């Protein structure tokens, strides 16, 4: 798993983590999220309000076009509901829709891992979406509360780490974009945290 990781990731993750100011600066954007989401603590987490028949997303404040970036998402297991998707989006991706869906990854402007189903979405309405990671250690993975999201803008990849192990690149084809941390959620009163881990 780790032999596929971006250059510099092991060193980035071993460094002292960004302080609370940096976590807020790179955290969720109150000015760039669904109307049904509130961003709290200056960006450290968001809460989705209990609005029926809605999927709701948020972007981070800072868009990345070069180098290696990583962040931790913390998403309580019992607050995931039917469609919990973690990834990245351009500034143009839609962040709300009036039904329950994997909104993140349902278009050209977003890329998501469904942490309930283990499926990857890009330009996908869901039918046929591939498993990630591929394999049997892949067929049994339960995504725990915390996961790392790893964006390599030199290779143009998005991948994830759990429990200290990089799980491989999930998506390629990201170069020449400005990409923001993103999630889409459906669960009433879910509280999803973002913890920026820095850049190389």
């Amino acid at each position: 798993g780790d032999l596929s990781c971006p250059e510099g990731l092991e060193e980035l993750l071993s460094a002292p983590p960004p302080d609370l100011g940096a976590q807020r600066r790179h955290g969720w954007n109150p000015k760039d999220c669904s109307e049904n989401i509130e961003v709290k603590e200056g960006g450290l987490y968001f809460e989705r309000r209990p609005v029926a028949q809605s999927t709701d997303g948020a972007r981070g404040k800072r868009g990345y076009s070069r180098g290696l970036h990583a962040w931790e998402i913390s998403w309580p297991l019992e607050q995931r509901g039917t469609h919990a998707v973690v990834g990245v989006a351009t500034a143009l991706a839609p962040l709300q829709t009036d039904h329950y869906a994997a909104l993140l990854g349902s278009n050209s402007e977003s890329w998501g891992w469904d942490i309930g189903r283990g499926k990857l979405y890009h330009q996908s309405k869901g039918p046929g979406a591939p498993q990630y990671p591929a394999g049997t250690q892949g067929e049994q993975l339960e995504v725990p509360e915390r996961l790392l999201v790893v964006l390599d803008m030199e290779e143009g990849t998005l991948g994830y780490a759990i429990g200290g192990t990089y799980l491989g690149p999930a998506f390629r084809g990201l170069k020449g974009r400005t990409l923001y941390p993103a999630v889409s959620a459906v669960w009433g009163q879910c509280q999803v945290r973002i913890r920026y881990l820095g850049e190389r």
């Binding site: 029926a52 039917t82 459906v186 009163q189």
Partner: peptide
Amino acid sequence: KDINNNVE
């Protein structure tokens, strides 16, 4: 509340 903990 519905399946996703949202107000009906």
